[PDB]
Write a protein that binds this ligand. Structure first.
Ligand SMILES: CC(=O)SCCNC(=O)CCNC(=O)[C@H](O)C(C)(C)COP(=O)(O)OP(=O)(O)OC[C@H]1O[C@@H](n2cnc3c(N)ncnc32)[C@H](O)[C@@H]1OP(=O)(O)O
Ligand SMILES: CC(C)(COP(=O)(O)OP(=O)(O)OC[C@H]1O[C@@H](n2cnc3c(N)ncnc32)[C@H](O)[C@@H]1OP(=O)(O)O)[C@@H](O)C(=O)NCCC(=O)NCCS
Ligand SMILES: N[C@@H](CS)C(=O)N[C@H]1[C@@H](O[C@@H]2[C@H](O)[C@H](O)[C@@H](O)[C@H](O)[C@H]2O)O[C@H](CO)[C@@H](O)[C@@H]1O
Length: 301
């Protein structure tokens, strides 16, 4: 039975399934956007009850922007190999007439095996890379560039202009409106001091225009973990060293934010990047990031 919205109680039950599974598998089974979708009316949901907590959950997001339908799903660790995962995946495939993809975060063995049993193949590879926060860079800020941080909604127009130009065609990051910014500003981890903006200054043709930005994020449920959450440079100002510079500034910012009674943890910064985004992979390789895990999107061949 598909539901177009979930009650507060249903949301609490799905969240418990997701967090419990994250602890057992070592990787969250559904992404952050699915957790935001639990309380909105934009997607469709399947809930599978035991004989009785919720033991299976699938979210199906419809096409939006340049992207197609996408499903994420999870089955309680103690209810696996009972056919629930197959049942939910077949339902989504039948509902979209075989057109949706499925994310397997961390591309764990059970998901690889389920994908083969269903006849699916990997069609998209999202790599998670990490770099320790030791030996931080000294960033070089070129003349004609001034850096500052997010001041509030007066900065949204420029941020959206640069985001949509840099991510034109990106299935999830492109074609944003003020609503996408607002839903992330309401997240517990949002910190205006961690959204770094690079503006053109007098020397350049367009003083005051945003050239690029680096939105950093500190993970709340993982001590010592930061993220290059969104990094983007206006196409008009690309290939001039600004991406490398912005990434370095954000690493410095995170290093500063991440005593005797603090647990010993070697802090690290992670990022996600499409395997075929050549420009970005080169920028990150240059700065010492290395592969950590892979998220694979599966679909009909
Ligand atoms: C294509 C995808 O599954 S993308 C979904 C990604 N989600 C995740 O990876 C989240 C964490 N994992 C889970 O929630 C679950 O392990 C799932 C959803 C991947 C599979 O859920 P389950 O309900 O256990 O799947 P299901 O019982 O239908 O298994 C179907 C077949 O896949 C294979 N399979 C599933 N898990 C495994 C495993 N751990 N080892 C080997 N084969 C497996 C088997 O052939 C199985 O049939 P069988 O039990 O008769 O041998
Ligand atoms: C990847 C990117 C930041 C590199 O920036 P750049 O200034 O062109 O590159 P550098 O000269 O600093 O190397 C830039 O090409 C860009 O904004 N690309 C599109 C958005 C994107 O892919 N961002 C990276 C995460 S998906
Ligand atoms: N870096 C951008 C542009 S390359 C990107 O690729 N980000 C990716 C990444 O976002 C992740 C967030 O960054 C991370 O904070 C959160 O914890 C995860 O659950 C995902 O929401 O994974 C998503 C798929 O799961 C994808 O839709 C998105 O574009």
């Amino acid at each position: 039975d598909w539901r177009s919205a979930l009650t507060a109680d249903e949301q609490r039950s799905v969240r418990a399934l997701v967090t419990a599974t994250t602890a057992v598998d070592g990787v969250a089974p559904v992404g952050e956007q699915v957790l935001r979708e639990l309380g909105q009316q934009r997607t469709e949901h399947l809930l599978v009850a035991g004989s009785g907590p919720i033991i299976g959950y699938l979210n199906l997001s419809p096409p939006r922007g340049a992207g197609g339908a996408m499903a994420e799903l999870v089955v309680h660790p103690q209810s696996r190999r009972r056919g629930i995962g197959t049942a939910m995946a077949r339902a989504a495939l039948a509902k979209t007439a075989g057109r949706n993809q499925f994310w397997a975060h961390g591309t764990l063995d059970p998901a690889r095996a389920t994908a083969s049993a269903l006849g699916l193949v990997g069609v998209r590879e999202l790599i998670q890379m990490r770099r320790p926060l030791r030996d931080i860079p000294e960033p070089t800020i070129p003349d004609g560039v001034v850096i500052r941080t997010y001041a509030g909604t007066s900065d949204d127009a420029e941020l959206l202009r640069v985001n949509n130009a840099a991510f034109a065609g990106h299935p999830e990051q492109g074609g944003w409106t003020a609503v996408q910014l607002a839903e992330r500003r309401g997240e517990a981890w949002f910190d205006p001091d961690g959204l770094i903006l690079a503006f053109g200054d007098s020397p350049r043709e367009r003083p005051g225009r945003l050239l690029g930005f680096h939105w950093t994020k500190v993970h709340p449920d993982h001590p010592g973990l930061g993220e290059v959450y969104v990094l983007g440079v206006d196409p008009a100002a690309q290939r001039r060293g600004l991406g490398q510079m912005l990434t370095s500034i954000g690493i410095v910012s995170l290093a500063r934010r991440l005593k005797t009674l603090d647990p010993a943890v070697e802090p690290a910064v992670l990022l996600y990047v499409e395997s075929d985004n050549v420009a970005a992979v080169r920028t990150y390789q240059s700065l010492g990031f290395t592969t950590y895990s892979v998220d694979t999107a599966y679909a009909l061949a």
